[PDB]
Amino acid sequence: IVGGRKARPRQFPFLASIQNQGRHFCGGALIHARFVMTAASCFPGVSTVVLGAYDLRRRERQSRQTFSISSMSENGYDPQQNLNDLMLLQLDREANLTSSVTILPLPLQNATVEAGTRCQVAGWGSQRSGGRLSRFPRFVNVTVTPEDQCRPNNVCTGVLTRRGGICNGDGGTPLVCEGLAHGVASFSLGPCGRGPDFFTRVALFRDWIDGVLNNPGPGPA
């Protein structure tokens, strides 16, 4: 996150850190006891999911819960068009709901968020393209852009400062507006924070998400 503030412990207790050999590469959100929502553009082979984290470099044994990924589900992701950038990760077991691990609720199918709506985005990403990750979670206030600056598959945001928004390591992290996960961080163009940030429009996929959630398992073999 660029242009943000250091989070406090448990300020975003739904947040996931997705790791490859212990290295954070994307975020996500717990959306069900058994499932984390992230971006399809974040996928690799043999990753883990860490919930309840605060400082990436600390063990935090009494706060964290760690999981392997038993299955991944997507709905027509197209990497060329950056379309349908949404992935559900089935965890190896149900997460325990604690003061440091909670579920982030979803919008109903086709719910909208109007231009001008204030949201937040949090994550462990860098402050500049190619810079180091932040060991602590950071967060920034963002505002939904006019539709003409975006595209239907996405919810787009900007900030009033020169640079604020997502960066490397924030892919997959949720956009929270009015208490709901209205977006999944997907991409931005140009320097991090110049704007707009593009998030997958979660509300387009609610019925599909519910299908996954209600039919756990690795799918056809």
Ligand X SMILES: *[C@@H]1O[C@H](CO)[C@@H](O[C@@H]2O[C@H](CO)[C@@H](O)[C@H](O)[C@H]2NC(C)=O)[C@H](O)[C@H]1NC(C)=O
Contact set with ligand X (CB under 6 A): 4-5, 139-141
Residue 164 interacting partner from ligand X, ligand NAG, Cl ion, none (CB closer than 5 to 8 Å by kind):
none
Contacts for 68 with CB less than 8 Å, ≥ 6 apart: 48, 49, 91, 92
- Site residues for ligand NAG, 120-149, by CB under 6 A, read none
Q: How far is the CB of 218 from ligand X (least distance, A)?
A: 40
Residue 212 interacting partner from ligand NAG, Cl ion, ligand X, none (CB closer than 5 to 8 Å by kind):
none
Residue 110 interacting partner from Cl ion, ligand NAG, ligand X, none (CB closer than 5 to 8 Å by kind):
ligand NAG
Q: How far is the CB of 119 from Cl ion (least distance, A)?
A: 14
On whether the CB atoms of residues 4 and 164 are closer than 8 A, the answer is: yes
- Site residues for ligand NAG, 91-110, by CB under 6 A, read 109-110
Q: Which CB sits closer to ligand X, 106 or 121?
A: 121
**Number of residues lying near ligand NAG (CB under 6 A):** 2
CA 65 to chain centre: 17
User: From the CB of residue 42, how many other CB atoms can be counted at a distance below 10 Å?
Assistant: 22
Beta-strand runs (E) in the chain: 5-6, 15-20, 23-32, 35-38, 48-51, 65-73, 87-91, 118-123, 138-144, 154-158, 174-177, 180-188, 197-201
On whether the CB atoms of residues 114 and 156 are closer than 8 A, the answer is: no
Q: How far is the CB of 25 from ligand X (least distance, A)?
A: 24
Residue 139 interacting partner from ligand X, ligand NAG, Cl ion, none (CB closer than 5 to 8 Å by kind):
ligand X
Residue 109 interacting partner from Cl ion, ligand NAG, ligand X, none (CB closer than 5 to 8 Å by kind):
ligand NAG
Q: Could you give the CA distance from residue 158 to residue 119 in angstroms, rounded to a whole number?
A: 10
| 108 burial level (CB within 10 Å; 0-12, 13-18, 19+) | exposed
Residues contributing to the site for ligand NAG (CB under 6 A): 109-110
- Residues in contact with Cl ion by the rule CB under 5 A: 107-108, 111
